[PDB]
Design a protein around this nucleic acid. Structure first.
Ligand SMILES: [Cl-]
Ligand SMILES: [Cl-]
Ligand SMILES: [Cl-]
Ligand SMILES: [Cl-]
Ligand SMILES: [Mn+2]
Ligand SMILES: [Mn+2]
Ligand SMILES: [Mn+2]
Ligand SMILES: [Mn+2]
Ligand SMILES: [Mn+2]
Ligand SMILES: [Mn+2]
Ligand SMILES: [Mn+2]
Ligand SMILES: [Mn+2]
Ligand SMILES: [Mn+2]
Ligand SMILES: [Mn+2]
Lengths: 96, 104, 77, 91, 92, 108, 87, 99
DNA sequence: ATCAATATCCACCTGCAGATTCTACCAAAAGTGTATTTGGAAACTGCTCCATCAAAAGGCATGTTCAGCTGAATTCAGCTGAACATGCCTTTTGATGGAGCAGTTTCCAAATACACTTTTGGTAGAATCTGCAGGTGGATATTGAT
DNA sequence: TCAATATCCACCTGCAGATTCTACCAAAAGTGTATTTGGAAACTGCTCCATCAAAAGGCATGTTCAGCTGAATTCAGCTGAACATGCCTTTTGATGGAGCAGTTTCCAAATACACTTTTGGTAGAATCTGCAGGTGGATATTGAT
């Protein structure tokens, strides 16, 4: 039976998702998360649809960029695998 | 006769002038300031639309979409610099894989 | 609800970020990071909402929060 | 009512690519763009006028603000267009 | 040649919090820079707030919201407490 | 006419309400300014000044100095999470940095 | 009408031991030989960018003297706010 | 009696403690001034400078370089090195958004 | 270091749903015709600072030597993370009410603007006042040794 | 354990820098009139929120193994430590005068205001572009030599 070697399909996915623009997190759980977080700041809140979509576009753009920097940190350490310490270095240098 | 027509512009000189007057920028606004500003905004719009139109045509699309704007902007060093901390919704990213990740 | 941001979703985000291989510990880490981000933005957004004496967070509330955090967003004005 | 730069963006688009259209989302991004650059330039011009104890924002403040905000060739071409437009307008 | 600054007020506050402590000219310059900076941030955010909401007036409400946007956590809470107390005392 | 009372005294403040009001009027922030706005702003500026001076004074005494210098301001700000956050993109002239050596660099 | 000796190659005035001292304050224990030239390039770029903006302000004000405030404004608008040099 | 010698690193660490304790500018005044004037002159000729303007520029520059060296150091340590190298600087600046 | 077999990608296709472009009505915004005011440029001029140089003392940069220890290169395997198959449940998609908010509009009481007049807190410069910078010297702590 | 060295820690005083004193006056405060605005009340649709339901496809799980990461190990050459030499920075002060500020005057350019003309926003109609899937060839990968 056929099996691709470790890495081939990963690369295929990179090309695939860098080619496209669709949101990568599921709508409903993101919305649920947003409402949960919002509740600890202000009671009785409602949300415009486009407000939640705005938050998702912003969040996903942020995470993708962070993963770019994280990847650079992993490669810097002569690895190809990203690890929490890569994220933490990236966020420290960003001033986060 | 409109001010934009006299200035050879498509962007609205009158509106830009009003937005300057009411934006709490200064107590007074010179007559040339909204003309200059409108001209600059129109220029930048033209540059972006020029490149984005090109990207749209490569994609054999007749309509410019956010993706084409992102491609146009990030592939242009100076536009990318100008919009360095800006997120284009539904823009995605430039195709880019670090060489070390590739086979061989 | 943070666990609703699933492993394959985070993987897709990382792929778009150009990542080829991913440690198992990334996912939880990512979630924490996401939460912090969301919290900050939303905290500001709601502040705007409250100033306008509204009970509905608008797209503009979010846009202003993002802008004032140096993360300008185009497309939702 | 609710203002945008949509019709002007479309006129410019028709100037540079006569047979090309634009999606609603893309137009929203163009509007965001124009408002953003407006705010940057107007704000810098405001500070320029304040620093120099002037109550008037003139084309000179706009020009200096453009030189501060725009990189290289974009700055030079923008300055050229603003100057040209003001010269055509004045007469 | 008359140049205004926040020096005497900074000094009065200093004497409030540390009665037997002084301050160098350089340090006072940093404090003046600080006050002007925060002034600009708060006033600017308030201006934006009033504009967003189609108000022509910056009121203590705009100041307060700006303070909440600009300041971190407990610092924001404490600042809001001071401003509110000051405005209510002033009103009376 | 009634005897002069200043707005700062009326507000219980040390920072100048009148001056802050004037700066708000001439800074082109809005067409109109409420009576409470410069009071609130002055109060906030005064408070923040007080917090920084409190911590900086503390550092000065820890260093057995009676006069606050820029170093003390830097120590006060960077050793306080919220002030450090507020002034995250700010340079304190002659402030130096916090003593900090990465553990991996120390001898075994 | 007695101008100074023309300034040249002054980036080399940013010496190896000076860069070492800066690195020490930055917590650096060991330094590759190629760092120093690298640092110079970086510093020059930074300086250029700040001074360019500063001079722009000076030119807008129709002055021939760069002021502390010109520099402060340049730095502020480059997101590197500096305290201590106002007034 | 062979002369005394500290091992590689001991004096470096000592220097770190020394310079993190203090606040004095670490670049020589006059050469920095010459640098500032040369660069400024390539934008506009015959410029003058307020003294405090040059001092402001030096404070800004040294603060910038020190912070950059902090991040660079973190990048070196990340790569399990103790020696900072140009690639460390380049990574730090790439992530900062300077490059 | 090429081959045969295999899987996925990528144009290209059509039909038609729906997203965009076109249209027409109409408040609202820009334009316009005049009148009137004013910000700031020009021309001065006084007088701070700034440019440049000078001397001298010694702090610091440079070049050298050399060996410790680091970075770089290499080896190897254990265990982690990728790929793939499987089947369950969460999300997606669609329908239906209706209650909650935005979003508007009207009109006075209340708030703010701004000019005039008057008073005092803030400033610049002079006079006092006093930390702490260096200079001294001894205790203590760390370092590297053969 | 020692010798060698650096750092720590009081102690000292004089003078450069900080604080206080003084008194004029710029700007804040008092007062009165003019002009703007905030909100209470009364509305109207229109987005959301709540709820229900089916079903699709995305996710969770378990298995297998390929290959990556980390540890261990080796070496040569670079960088840190130490030292002499002498340059050029630092410090303090002179000497001119370039160029900021400070004043005064007066139009070119801006605001103000009353009223008309033109334009841009909006929602539905009219066009016509993408996209949903499905094909076939291009391209790329894998395992075997
Ligand atoms: Cl890790
Ligand atoms: Cl003008
Ligand atoms: Cl108020
Ligand atoms: Cl390197
Ligand atoms: Mn030159
Ligand atoms: Mn005048
Ligand atoms: Mn090693
Ligand atoms: Mn194995
Ligand atoms: Mn008095
Ligand atoms: Mn001492
Ligand atoms: Mn007077
Ligand atoms: Mn009139
Ligand atoms: Mn029309
Ligand atoms: Mn398809």
């Amino acid at each position: 039976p056929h099996r691709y070697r470790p890495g081939t399909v990963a690369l295929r996915e990179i090309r695939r998702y860098q080619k496209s623009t669709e949101l990568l997190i599921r709508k409903l759980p993101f919305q649920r998360l947003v409402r949960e977080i919002a509740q600890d700041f202000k009671t009785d809140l409602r949300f415009q649809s486009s407000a939640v979509m705005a938050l998702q576009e912003a969040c996903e753009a942020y995470l993708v960029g962070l993963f770019e920097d994280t990847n650079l940190c992993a490669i810097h350490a002569k690895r190809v695998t990203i690890m929490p310490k890569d994220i933490q270095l990236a966020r420290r240098i960003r001033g986060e | 006769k409109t001010r934009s027509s006299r200035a050879g512009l498509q962007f609205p000189v009158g509106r830009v002038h009003r937005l300057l007057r009411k934006g709490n920028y200064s107590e007074r606004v010179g007559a040339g300031a909204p003309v200059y500003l409108a001209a600059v905004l129109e220029y930048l719009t033209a540059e972006i639309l020029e490149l984005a139109g090109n990207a749209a045509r490569d994609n054999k699309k007749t309509r410019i979409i956010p993706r084409h704007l992102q491609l146009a902007i990030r592939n242009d060093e100076e536009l990318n610099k100008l919009l360095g901390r800006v997120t284009i919704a539904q823009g995605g990213v430039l195709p880019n894989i670090q060489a070390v990740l590739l086979p061989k | 609800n943070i666990q609703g941001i699933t492993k394959p979703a985070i993987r897709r985000l990382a792929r778009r970020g150009g990542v080829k291989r991913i440690s198992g510990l990334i996912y939880e880490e990512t979630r924490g990071v996401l939460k912090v981000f969301l919290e900050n933005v939303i905290r500001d957004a709601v502040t705007y909402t409250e100033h306008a004496k509204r009970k509905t967070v608008t797209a503009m509330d979010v846009v202003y929060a993002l802008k004032r955090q140096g993360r300008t967003l185009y497309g939702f004005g | 009512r609710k203002e945008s730069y949509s019709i002007y963006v479309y006129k410019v688009l028709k100037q540079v690519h006569p047979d090309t259209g634009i999606s609603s989302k893309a137009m929203g991004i163009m509007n965001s763009f124009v408002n953003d650059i407006f705010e940057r330039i107007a704000g810098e011009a405001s500070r320029l006028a304040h620093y120099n104890k002037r109550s008037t924002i003139t084309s000179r403040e706009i020009q200096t603000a453009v030189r501060l905000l725009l990189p290289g060739e974009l700055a030079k071409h923008a300055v050229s267009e603003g100057t040209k437009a003001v010269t055509k307008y004045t007469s």
